[PDB]
């Protein structure tokens, strides 16, 4: 239910906990909610305002082909990850306004081993999914072998992907947001929860419903399933204290039906094209700081 | 309160589909579920059936000190754990007795098997106990909760004490969203007696209040569920102890919540009783350190609960 994610956004203005950290960010916060979203009712793209679907899709499809390389994202019109990757290469040892981030933008696309070098990115999602290091120097494989699972062991309990390793956590950069999450299959229906340990309420959680619910689409294509429910667990749960004015003008508007997604007739073979939603009419776009 | 677990057991007593579970019992079960336990009305051990406290802290310390094998709890007489250990040392070559194949199960249905059973158990429990050899080899359960909060193994040759981690990181970072620690070493999964029920946790701070998140991704909800929140609220209390906080809420996150076929009974009883009030957690005001707190130094007061429902366990 969308009025859910509404509902959330107006208790943390209610009854939020407002926090200064050191450097004077400011948020209200609760700790401990869960939404859910019945996928049979239609695609939780937020129709309270514009969420560009692009983006999701082509960070969700680089997530799994596990690849940790921007030149995918890049040839789609994805910069999200792309400023680590730029900030890397000026203290670098090769190397008013800064065009030097379009040269390097164009040499990732266009040439073999330079994107190699520059694009890599390590550990992140794509290869916390695909690819979990073991202590002989082997790898686990979460997702694929969650799918298998799926296939042959549905009443399974035990289908888990897991991102959060504490060997690894203190060192990285942006430790994973999306900690872990649980698939679960009953009447031929699959459905997904997921466990989210910091949330951004107004910019990043309506990005991470639709990014699971897509998910839960693909991983239910792939194993001949209908899609059930998704789960959307918080632990901290936070909107910016310069979020509020956006929060409470989308309160006011009234929510529209959720659109259709269409998937063309396994999904580590889709690209861009083969993922559309249909009927989507939301109301404009609502700008905010970053 | 109390209300909310009692209305999770109603709920799936009246909406929960039939499953084919691992134990080959049979369950009804719902996927998502949340419960909000205020531990500054009263430490959550159920009053409408007696639950055994001096077994969820056995179990608790049994964790904290970081111990995998059984041997501990039987000297406490807790045996909760005794199934999966027998298990697997009647699967083993060392084993003489007679056939165990589905030993869960036949104990239910055959008095002859019954008795035979526990007398295979009550000199596995013997052996574990006085045999230092048998003991090391089967009293092991593998990397369960104990060795991944105090010794996650490192690929460099080391180990992450993750619980003493995230306790330090309370002290001096409260206001941190990582404040984590799993059970869910994918590594080790496959060499547990059994993968982490529950799986991961989550802490949290305001006005000097702590507040502790599970999220159990399997949860047996007339026998286990009862014992682990009993468990995380203890929990959540002896690091408000050492840090110096108040307690605020344990905020109970279920996967795949289910009522075993053979605990619809149980689970029905209860539900015909009148709640009580929660009784009162005492600790041990000397006692400074979470991992310095031994049995006598907890304790549970003004516990007047309805009697006790037994249950089959499902192995
Ligand atoms: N099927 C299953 N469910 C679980 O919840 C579970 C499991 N297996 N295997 C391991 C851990 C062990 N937990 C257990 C918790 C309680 C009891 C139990 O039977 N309690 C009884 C007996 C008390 C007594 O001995 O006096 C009770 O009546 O409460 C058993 C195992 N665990 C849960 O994490």
């Known amino acids: 239910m969308e009025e859910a994610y509404l509902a959330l956004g107006k208790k943390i203005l209610e009854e939020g906990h407002f926090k200064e950290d ?3 960010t400011g948020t209200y916060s609760l700790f401990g909610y869960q939404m ?9 793209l937020l129709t309270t305002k514009r969420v560009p679907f692009g983006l999701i899709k082509s960070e969700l499809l680089w997530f799994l082909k596990g690849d940790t390389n921007i030149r995918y994202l890049l040839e789609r019109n994805n910069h999200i990850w792309d400023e680590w990757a730029f900030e890397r290469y000026v203290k670098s040892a090769d190397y ?8 390097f933008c ?12 520059y694009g890599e990115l390590g550990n992140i999602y794509g290869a916390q999914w695909r690819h979990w290091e073991t ?3 082997s790898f686990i494989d979460q997702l694929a072998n969650v799918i298998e699972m799926i296939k042959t062991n549905p009443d399974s309990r035990r289908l888990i992907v897991s991102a959060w390793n504490p060997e690894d956590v203190p060192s990285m950069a942006l430790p994973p947001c999306h900690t872990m999450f649980q698939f679960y299959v009953n009447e031929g229906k699959l459905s997904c ?4 340990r910091s949330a951004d309420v107004f910019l990043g959680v309506p990005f991470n419903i639709a990014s699971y619910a897509l998910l839960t689409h693909l991983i239910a294509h792939e194993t001949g399933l209908e899609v059930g429910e998704f789960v959307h667990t918080l632990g901290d749960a936070h909107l910016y204290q310069n ?6 003008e989308q309160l006011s508007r009234e929510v529209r039906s959720f659109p259709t997604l269409v998937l063309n ?3 580590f073979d889709f690209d861009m094209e083969d993922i559309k939603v249909e009927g989507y009419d939301p109301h404009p776009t609502i700008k905010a700081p970053i």
């Open 36 to 44: 859910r979203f019945d996928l049979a009712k239609g695609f939780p």
């Open 193 to 196: 929860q997921l466990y989210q």
């Open 243 to 248: 979020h509020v004015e956006q929060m409470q």
């Open 265 to 267: 007739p396994s999904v």
């Open 22 to 24: 050191r450097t004077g």
């Open 96 to 103: 008013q306004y800064k065009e030097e981030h379009q040269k």
């Open 106 to 117: 164009d040499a990732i696309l266009n040439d073999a081993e330079f994107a190699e070098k």
């Open 135 to 137: 202590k002989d120097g």
